[PDB]
Write a protein that binds this ligand. Sequence first.
Ligand SMILES: *Cc1ccc(-n2cnc(C(F)(F)F)c2)cc1
Ligand SMILES: *Cc1ccc(-n2cnc(C(F)(F)F)c2)cc1
Ligand SMILES: [Ca+2]
Ligand SMILES: [Ca+2]
Lengths: 228, 228, 6, 6
Amino acid sequence: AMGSMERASLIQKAKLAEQAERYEDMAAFMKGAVEKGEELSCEERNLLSVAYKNVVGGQRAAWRVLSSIEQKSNGPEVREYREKVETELQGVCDTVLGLLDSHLIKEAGDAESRVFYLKMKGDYYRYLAEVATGDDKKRIIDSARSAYQEAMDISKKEMPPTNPIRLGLALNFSVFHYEIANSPEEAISLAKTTFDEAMADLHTLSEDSYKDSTLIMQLLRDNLTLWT
Amino acid sequence: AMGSMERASLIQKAKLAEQAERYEDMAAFMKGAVEKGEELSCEERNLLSVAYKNVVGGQRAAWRVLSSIEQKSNGPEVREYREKVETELQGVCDTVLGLLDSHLIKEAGDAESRVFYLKMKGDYYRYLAEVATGDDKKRIIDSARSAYQEAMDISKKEMPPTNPIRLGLALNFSVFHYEIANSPEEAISLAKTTFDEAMADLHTLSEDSYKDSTLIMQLLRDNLTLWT
Amino acid sequence: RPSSWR
Amino acid sequence: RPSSWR
Ligand SMILES: *Cc1ccc(-n2cnc(C(F)(F)F)c2)cc1
Ligand SMILES: *Cc1ccc(-n2cnc(C(F)(F)F)c2)cc1
Ligand SMILES: [Ca+2]
Ligand SMILES: [Ca+2]
């Protein structure tokens, strides 16, 4: 639906949609920008991620409310409506994964872009895994694991331990271990090792970079406090 | 799209959508319930109002953000996107007004139902008036005034001064006077008279009814404190 | 700015 | 329950 709008206008309206907290519009604008076929800048990648994270975040929150009501129940209405929200969530995840596959990841050569997109691929397979129950559940979980793992291998070779993308990736991969893969010890080990190696690299950073890194580092600490 | 769902199932799913904070779904379910052609119960009227108030409330908040950005600007993108949100808001208002006209109001014979729907008609013409700038702006304002006025005449004849619907109607009609009709003195007079006559009728109420009435009465006080 | 019924 | 990147 966005094929007739200029790339620059789509980016400008995505930023306007963010200010208006219109995240469905934001995602549609950024999907149109991706489909122009050019690679995304650092700022543009963040706009894409912010838009779809907010859209699927609302869907996940609603799915969790309905799933809880459904569990307490066990007519068809609660199941039907949970299935409706579930299907809409899966549609958004499939859309994001389709953008990554066609063709963001294959064109991403720099570490900061490639790690960003692979982390995104892990995240949205993780969201699919949260609602999966069928014959493809193990394959969905492994698709999330594979994307996170490739992103992790690149980040450890190409990025300092305080890099915010590296930190956010490790944070989310540790959540994957705890919440999806039933591996709480792997989750705790990853969070601790990530936090400690970031701590040892903070001395290299400017005041602003130090603020960026310690902010995500606190989320690792929050999870370790929750988990131990 | 809801023609094939049972009325009772639409009501049940509207309540589920409210719990999940899925207000667009809630409104669609309640629109389907209205279009079954039966009159709405007290609880069902509240579900209809809550659903569309939340949908149009998000649109109004976004429109106000974009309009502010547009004013500070004075390319076409800010105007275009404000117009897009504006058109979507007007569409929702037209949908609500269409439900009231076809055929909720004409079938509403009891004071509590008729005042409720006429207040709703005033509200959504008021929301249309907030964004109106053209040859029909004065007619939109008068349509809001006419609906509020009929609701007010009925409420004063048929309802005690502490009735929550009567109070909420007077509150919103006073906001109409202040914000839309450029009549701040009318707004202040209405809020004060409404508050004072409710104060004098509180002694008749149960503890629970007293709580309901004083809650809305505080909103009248909040506006008087803002306006004086 | 002013409060309508909520 | 646990914090992912926000
Ligand atoms: C998953 C993820 C996404 C974005 C970030 N991030 C980008 N830029 C920053 C900061 F502003 F430098 F902190 C953070 C991190 C992880
Ligand atoms: C505009 C409006 C809508 C609903 C109410 N209201 C209904 N029921 C109550 C309470 F729960 F009794 F307080 C309030 C009032 C105004
Ligand atoms: Ca490239
Ligand atoms: Ca009737």
